[PDB]
C-alpha cells in the first residue's frame, strides 16, 4: 500500500541564527565563543620562568631581586605586576623596546666584557641594593674617584663584539643628589660621557640636583643600551658619573647555550605544569576547541580570535520540525 520519506525531530531543539532569520530551531548545536579560561599559566611541555618580583629589564643589570635570573633559558617568560627592574632609583632609555627584545630571546646568556681599572674606586655600593650588606647591580661597576673630592681621570674603554650574534651592552649615567655630592665623588669640573659604535654615537652629561627621595636616595642612575653587531667595537670615554658594564648580554635565539624564541606574557596567575596551553592572558590560559573567545582582547600566543559577542551558536544538525497530531 504506501511508503513515506522522512527525517528525525526532537521535542525541544536549540535556537540558532542564519543570514536570513533569527531563532531558527535546529536538532543539535554547539557554542563557538569561549567564555571560560583556565586560571593558571599552563606550561606543560614548555620551559617557563616566573620572574616574580624581578622586572624583566633587571635580568640584564642585576638588582638583588633578579639574582636567580641573570642567565636564564625560557620558551615562556612570565612578568608580574609588582616587579621592579631596578634598586637604585632611575629608569631605562627606550625601555619598552628593550623589553620586547628580552621577551622573545629564549633567555639571555652573559659574558664578561674584559674591562680592568686603575686608581679608581670601582666597588661603589648603595643601601638601595642590599644583599648581605649594601651592594650594587651584579653586572655593573660604579666608578668613583678613590679619594673624596679628587677629580676623576679621563678614561677610554673599548669592547669588540667577537660572537656571531649581536650583543646587548648597557651602561649608566649617575646623577648626583646635588652639585656638592658630584664634587665629592667625581671631583669638580665638566662631566662628560661619550659612547661610540659604528652605527651609534651619543654623549651624556650628568644633570645633578635635588630629586624626590625614592628607595632612600635622591640621586638617580639612568641606563642606556645599544645592539652591537659582530666584529664591531663600542668605545667608552668618560671622566665621571659612569656606571660601567662588566658583562655583555647575548640572546639565546641567536646562538647548547641555544633556546629558540620565547613568548613573554604578563599574568597574575599561579603556574601549573600539569595543563597544556598556547594562549595566555592576565587571568591565565585559554585552551579551547572553540574558534573565538570573549575572555580578553589582549591575549597573546596561539589564540582564538577575540569577539564582542559572548555567544554565537553553531548548528550541527537540521532544522527541527516537531511532529504533528
Amino acid at each position: 500500500d504506501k511508503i513515506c520519506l522522512g527525517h528525525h525531530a526532537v521535542a525541544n531543539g536549540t535556537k540558532v541564527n542564519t543570514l536570513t532569520e533569527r531563532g531558527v530551531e535546529v536538532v543539535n548545536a554547539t557554542e563557538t565563543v569561549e567564555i571560560t579560561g583556565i586560571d593558571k599559566v599552563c606550561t606543560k611541555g614548555k620551559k617557563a620562568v616566573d620572574l616574580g618580583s624581578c622586572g624583566i629589564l633587571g635580568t640584564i643589570i642585576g638588582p638583588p631581586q633578579c639574582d636567580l635570573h641573570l642567565e636564564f633559558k625560557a620558551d615562556l617568560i612570565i612578568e608580574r605586576r609588582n616587579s621592579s627592574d631596578i634598586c637604585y632609583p632611575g629608569r631605562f632609555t627606550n625601555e619598552e623596546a628593550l623589553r620586547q627584545i628580552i621577551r622573545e630571546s629564549g633567555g639571555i646568556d652573559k659574558e664578561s666584557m674584559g674591562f680592568r681599572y686603575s686608581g679608581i674606586r670601582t666597588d661603589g655600593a648603595t643601601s638601595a641594593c642590599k644583599r648581605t650588606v649594601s651592594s650594587f647591580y651584579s653586572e655593573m661597576k660604579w666608578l668613583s674617584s678613590s679619594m673624596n673630592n679628587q677629580v676623576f681621570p679621563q678614561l677610554n674603554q673599548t669592547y669588540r663584539n667577537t660572537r656571531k650574534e649581536p650583543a646587548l651592552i648597557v651602561w649608566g649615567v649617575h646623577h648626583s643628589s646635588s652639585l656638592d655630592e658630584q664634587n665629592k665623588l667625581y671631583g669638580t669640573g665638566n662631566k662628560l660621557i661619550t659612547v661610540g659604535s659604528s652605527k651609534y654615537q651619543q654623549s651624556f652629561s650628568p644633570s645633578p640636583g635635588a630629586r624626590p627621595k625614592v628607595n632612600g636616595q635622591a640621586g638617580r642612575i639612568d641606563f642606556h643600551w645599544m645592539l652591537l653587531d659582530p666584529g664591531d667595537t663600542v668605545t667608552f670615554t668618560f671622566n665621571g658619573a659612569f656606571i660601567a658594564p662588566d658583562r655583555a648580554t647575548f640572546l639565546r635565539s641567536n646562538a647548547i647555550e641555544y633556546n629558540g624564541k620565547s613568548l613573554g606574557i604578563q599574568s597574575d596567575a599561579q603556574i601549573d605544569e600539569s595543563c597544556e596551553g598556547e594562549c595566555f592572558y592576565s587571568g591565565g590560559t585559554i585552551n579551547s576547541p572553540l574558534p573565538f573567545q570573549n575572555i580578553d582582547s589582549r591575549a597573546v600566543g596561539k589564540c582564538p580570535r577575540y569577539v564582542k559577542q559572548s555567544s554565537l551558536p553553531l548548528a550541527l544538525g537540521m532544522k527541527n520540525v516537531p511532529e504533528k497530531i
Binding site: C4, G6, V26, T32, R99, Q100, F292, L314, L316, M318
Partner: protein, 168 residues
C-alpha cells in the same frame, strides 16, 4: 493511525537515523533509518568548527603594556584594537550565520535527493500523495518495501498490476 512524510512533519520517533522510510502494507507499519543518506549529511557537518578555526586563528605578541603603560601612542593603539575587534566580530557572526544556513539547507537537500531517488525508482507503479509519501498501486509486502529501501526494486515486475489499479 495514518502516516505522513517530510512535507508536513519531522519524526520524533526516528531515533537511529537522520533520514528514513516509514511504510504501510498488509503486514502492518514499520520505520527504518537510512544509513547512506544520514552519513552523508553527518560527513558534511563534522569538520565545521575545525573549519572556523582554520579561517580565523592567528599568532601575535604584546604591543602595549599592562603593568607599565607606554599616552598619545596608547590612545590610538586602544582605538585601533577596538576597531579591528568590531571587524572581526562582524566577520565571526557572519561566518556562523553562513555556516548555519548551509547546514539547514544541506539537510533539506539530502531529504529531497532521497525522495527524488524513490520517486524515480517507483516509476509508474506509485503516485505522490503530497505529504512526502507514495501511494503504491500494487501489493507490496515487507520484502518489497526493503526492495524500495535498498534500491533494488524492479518496477517492471509490478507494472501491469499497478496500471490496472491506477487507471480503473
Amino acid at each position: 493511525g495514518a502516516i505522513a512524510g517530510f512535507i508536513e512533519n519531522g519524526w520524533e520517533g526516528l531515533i537511529d537515523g537522520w533520514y528514513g522510510f516509514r511504510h504501510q502494507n498488509a503486514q502492518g507499519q514499520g520505520t527504518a533509518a537510512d544509513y547512506k543518506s544520514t552519513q552523508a549529511a553527518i560527513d558534511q557537518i563534522t569538520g565545521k568548527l575545525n573549519r572556523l578555526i582554520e579561517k580565523t586563528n592567528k599568532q601575535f605578541e604584546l604591543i602595549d603594556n599592562e603593568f607599565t603603560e607606554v599616552q598619545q601612542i596608547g590612545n590610538v593603539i586602544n582605538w585601533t584594537r577596538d576597531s579591528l575587534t568590531e571587524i572581526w566580530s562582524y566577520n565571526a557572526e557572519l561566518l556562523v550565520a553562513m555556516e548555519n544556513q548551509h547546514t539547514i539547507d544541506l539537510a533539506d537537500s539530502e531529504m529531497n535527493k532521497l525522495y527524488e531517488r524513490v520517486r524515480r525508482q517507483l516509476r509508474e507503479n506509485a503516485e505522490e500523495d503530497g505529504t512526502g509519501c507514495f501511494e503504491i498501486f500494487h501489493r507490496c509486502d515487507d520484502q518489497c518495501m526493503e526492495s524500495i529501501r535498498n534500491n533494488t526494486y524492479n518496477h517492471t515486475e509490478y507494472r501491469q498490476e499497478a496500471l490496472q489499479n491506477r487507471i480503473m
